[PDB]
Design a protein around this ligand. Sequence first.
Ligand code: MET
Length: 519
Amino acid sequence: VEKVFFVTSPIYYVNAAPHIGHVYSTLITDVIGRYHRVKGERVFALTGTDEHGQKVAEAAKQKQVSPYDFTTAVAGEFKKCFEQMDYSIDYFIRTTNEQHKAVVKELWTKLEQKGDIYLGRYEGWYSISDESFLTPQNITDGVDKDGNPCKVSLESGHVVTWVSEENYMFRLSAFRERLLEWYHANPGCIVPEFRRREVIRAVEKGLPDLSVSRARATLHNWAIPVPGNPDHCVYVWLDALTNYLTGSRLRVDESGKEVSLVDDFNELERFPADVHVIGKDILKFHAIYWPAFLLSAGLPLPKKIVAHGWWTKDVFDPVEKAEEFGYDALKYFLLRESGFSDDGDYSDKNMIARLNGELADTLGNLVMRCTSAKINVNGEWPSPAAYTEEDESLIQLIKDLPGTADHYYLIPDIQKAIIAVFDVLRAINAYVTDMAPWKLVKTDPERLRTVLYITLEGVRVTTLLLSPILPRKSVVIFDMLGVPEVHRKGIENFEFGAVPPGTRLGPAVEGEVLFSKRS
Ligand code: MET
């Protein structure tokens, strides 16, 4: 299928200012989308804000402001944060958007028409902060904002309240077997594997029907009305999930403004998403509810959901840390340190260790060596002579790197991808140290040609595969190496030897620093 590669992030509640967590989830989305662009693929990356609901309404009230004013303000904060963070997201959707509201009504009507929505009651627990329905097995004892007894969610520890309302119910129970068939027929669809196992376990125990409307008073009328029943408002999560479907049907300005909503998702060739990036805290909504709505509506299911280890929505300001330590470096650190396990050492100490250790010493030092006037005296890419077995062994590593990094990026496990690239980087260092090209300038010019060219090409290819992570710094590196633009993207330039000998390096600004060491 030739289609637009469609990668999304969650859309974040606007009850508070954007923080780390939002920046991480969108960072992952950004990176995946950036990697597919360097492969020369069509990409559409989506991010945005979740603006309706009781949670947000009550946050706006607590600040003595109108919901319209409050969502617009916080959303603007989110837009400023993501711009400052230097992403490359193709569109920023808001659920207050009028074109979005129309897709929600369409989808609602489609589910109703398919027979999958009936009027019933929900009587049970609810976490307003998580906008989540919970069974009694999922709550426990706690304390409110005053030490007063109360019940909280096991999931998140937020206060839960009992709800007894006549609600429109979605027939989630009817989709249990079809979802299990989906999980098993596509064992890559949920990443990492242990979260794929969790979802299956849960669906296997059985599924209750899901409330998809609420009484309009309860939401403070800050919500999308149920089509043909203005007493009710569409559940914030059904509303929220439809974000993905909406964004797949929006034609976008050259300045990121929606200008048109197309009738049919096929028209823009984006739906269904090839990867949903989410945090572990919103797995049920994306891996159970979402495909059930889509199976009901006759729509196509996503290909991959990847749930990382952070808590999506919840001492570290992203922009200030990036001002201190560097943007690409901060992004690199976040991506390198965490797996699907949120047990990352995020201290200033470990940030500096990785900055100095890997960015400055492994990669930075290596770039400076092969470009320096000491070693590379003609400031160009040499023609290599004959390769020795040690030469060939390093070359093999470089030739194998792209296919390996590619598979990691596609899982997606971006940490593993970085580790693979830096293994090759550590090897190239060991080769350089072994060959001592600095001594070779004098002793053996022909030998140097070989060592230097292999060093250049290794640095080029690692840098290319590192470019979705270090997008500003890779441009600097390519500039230093003198790599023509056309060679900076495309799978054509994954191949060893795509930049010809004789290519001149780019001027030198000997106020160096690729990465300046710290503390
Ligand atoms: C459809 S993504 C919804 C995510 C939710 N608004 C959150 O912030 O966790």
